[PDB]
């Protein structure tokens, strides 16, 4: 399974600062057996794709579920491909929990994006109140099931576990990350196939730094990272070399 | 009051088709007394600004309420200006009614966008169930009040009335019904803000408008222009630019 490092720039950066960041990424050596993807703010997908070297792929941070329509403020998978981007991040914790995107909607988006030829980074995660109630498995399995029901071919899909319970005074240990990733791969093994379980990347979307990345990456069922705003710093190059 | 024509392209188009549309807009003669703004899909704001002639301004279709942050999928007013766009459409009916954007949030967005030096096209409107209950005024006045509470300088603001009750329901709105809402809205501004703001602020019509109806709508005393939907992608848009 190839190491997968996604940098989600979120709502940060301008042409000048992002152009500088891109130059540092273009200059860096991507190791063997490693896949790097960058998700700029929507206004800069096109800009980023033109400036970034082909060795780094570009992702949209969100999309909608039909090709064209009366949806002020949205973008379709067709627009994303037309700008040269090959991935879309779907179901990120901020879309679910700040912007109220339901599992039904996320499923419909997954299906449309895949049908339009995009790769999908599909995000899942449980909140603090869900974890403390002891329904971590119920939550992430129901989220993964909705994704799985809308995926025909898994070769274009990467799963990202976001420990929302620990994003913004509790920290998650590498053992707690491994435990969720293994239960998730176990779910795929039972409900899809062993081939899909074996081959699908499950990446960690919790807090990761240059000092933690190596231990996290060495976990058997952690296949990489979906990094937040820290992906804008020089630190991101250390995470690329976490193996 | 300078006549104002906004074309909201919504979630439509690709570089090729939008590039063709832009060539037609670049070739058209913008009248002297007229201000034309185009709102492309977010992925094409930058593309559209580089291709469009300066005589047409560019608007974002939405934005968020802080300059930078952990808000996957959003863009800030700073990003919009950095791409050469000078306007943002806020509180469009689709953001309110498909995507659940509250009045509180829209107010916060208005304030941040204006503070960052953008112009704002601030949209308001009542649904069918609200109109048939007879609370058209209550709804549009509450929406306009939330906007007004977040506007320090009105010179950068345009109000757009969207008759949501008539967009996509099988009801059509007459030019008399448009005028009635626009005049009550200007009356509200006159009483609750100032006469100067009432007299100078453009109130544009965001309902269904065609080349055959635009002239009668534009001649209404309190209709100052249009925020057109997907019909702004057709040749028809040029007739609307010349509605006066």
From Swiss-Prot, chain A:
InterPro entries: Aldolase_TIM (IPR013785), TIM_sf (IPR035990), TrioseP_Isoase_bac/euk (IPR022896), Triosephosphate_isomerase (IPR000652), Triosephosphate_isomerase_AS (IPR020861). It comes from the Eukaryota. The modification 3'-nitrotyrosine is found at residues 64, 204. The modification Phosphoserine is found at residues 17, 76, 102, 155, 193, 207, 218. Its EC number is 5.3.1.1, 4.2.3.3. Pathway: Carbohydrate degradation; glycolysis; D-glyceraldehyde 3-phosphate from glycerone phosphate: step 1/1; Carbohydrate biosynthesis; gluconeogenesis. There is a cross-link at residue 138 (Glycyl lysine isopeptide (Lys-Gly) (interchain with G-Cter in SUMO1)). It catalyses: D-glyceraldehyde 3-phosphate = dihydroxyacetone phosphate; dihydroxyacetone phosphate = methylglyoxal + phosphate. The keyword Lyase applies. Its main location: cytoplasm. The modification N6-succinyllysine is found at residues 145, 152, 189. The modification N6-methyllysine is found at residue 189. It is found in: Cytoplasm. One of its GO terms (biological process) is methylglyoxal biosynthetic process. GO terms for molecular function: methylglyoxal synthase activity; protein homodimerization activity; triose-phosphate isomerase activity; ubiquitin protein ligase binding. The active site is at 92 (electrophile), 162 (proton acceptor). GO terms for cellular component: cytosol; extracellular exosome; extracellular space; nucleus. The modification N6-acetyllysine is found at residues 10, 152, 189, 233. Gene3D superfamilies: Aldolase class I (3.20.20.70). Keywords: Acetylation, Cytoplasm, Disease variant, Gluconeogenesis, Glycolysis, Hereditary hemolytic anemia, Isomerase, Isopeptide bond, Lyase, Methylation, Nitration, Phosphoprotein, Ubl conjugation. The modification Phosphothreonine is found at residue 209. It is linked to Triosephosphate isomerase deficiency: An autosomal recessive multisystem disorder characterized by congenital hemolytic anemia, progressive neuromuscular dysfunction, susceptibility to bacterial infection, and cardiomyopathy. Triosephosphate isomerase is an extremely efficient metabolic enzyme that catalyzes the interconversion between dihydroxyacetone phosphate (DHAP) and D-glyceraldehyde-3-phosphate (G3P) in glycolysis and gluconeogenesis. It is also responsible for the non-negligible production of methylglyoxal a reactive cytotoxic side-product that modifies and can alter proteins, DNA and lipids. Belongs to the triosephosphate isomerase family. This is Triosephosphate isomerase.
């Amino acid at each position: 399974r190839k190491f997968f490092v996604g940098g989600n720039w979120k709502m940060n950066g301008r042409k000048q600062s992002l152009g500088e960041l891109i130059g540092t990424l273009n200059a860096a050596k991507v190791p063997a057996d490693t896949e790097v993807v960058c998700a700029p703010p929507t206004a800069y997908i096109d800009f980023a794709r033109q400036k970034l070297d082909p060795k780094i792929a570009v992702a949209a941070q969100n999309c909608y579920k039909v090709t064209n329509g009366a949806f002020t403020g949205e973008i379709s998978p067709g627009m994303i491909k037309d700008c040269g981007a090959t991935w879309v991040v779907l179901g990120h914790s901020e879309r679910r929990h700040v912007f109220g995107e339901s599992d039904e909607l996320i499923g419909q988006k997954v299906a449309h994006a895949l049908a339009e030829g995009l790769g999908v980074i599909a995000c899942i995660g449980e909140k603090l109140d869900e974890r403390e109630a002891g329904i971590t498995e119920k939550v992430v399995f129901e989220q993964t099931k909705v994704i799985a029901d809308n995926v025909k071919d898994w070769s274009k899909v990467v799963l990202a576990y976001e420990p929302v319970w620990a994003i913004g005074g509790k920290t998650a240990t590498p053992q707690q990350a491994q435990e969720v990733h293994e239960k998730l791969r176990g779910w795929l093994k039972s409900n899809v196939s062993d081939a899909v379980a074996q081959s699908t990347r499950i990446i960690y979307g919790g807090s990761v730094t240059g000092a933690t990345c190596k231990e996290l990456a060495s976990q058997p069922d952690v296949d990489g990272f979906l990094m937040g705003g820290a992906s804008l710093k020089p630190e991101f190059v250390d995470i690329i070399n976490a193996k």
